[PDB]
């Protein structure tokens, strides 16, 4: 298998939080119309939804 992350084909709603416990920066992403969030690489989020990433940083900050 079942799609995860950006491969679910859902619009990102908001970043719930960030973590780098795996070696690289990841974001816990909430998608529109789903209560199932999943971890996506920051490197992918930066490109695919920059404004969602920027909103997360700006609120903090």
């Amino acid at each position: 298998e079942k799609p995860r992350g950006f491969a679910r084909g859902l619009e990102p709603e908001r970043i719930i939080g960030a973590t780098d416990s795996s070696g690289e920066l990841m974001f816990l992403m909430k998608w529109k119309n789903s209560d199932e969030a999943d971890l996506v690489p920051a490197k992918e989020a930066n490109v695919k939804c920059p404004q969602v990433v920027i909103s997360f940083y700006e609120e903090r900050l």
Binding site: I15, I16, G17, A18, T19, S21, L28, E59, R60
Partner: peptide, 7 residues
């Protein structure tokens, strides 16, 4: 398994 929150 730690997450920094929005915020």
């Amino acid at each position: 398994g730690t997450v920094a929150l929005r915020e």
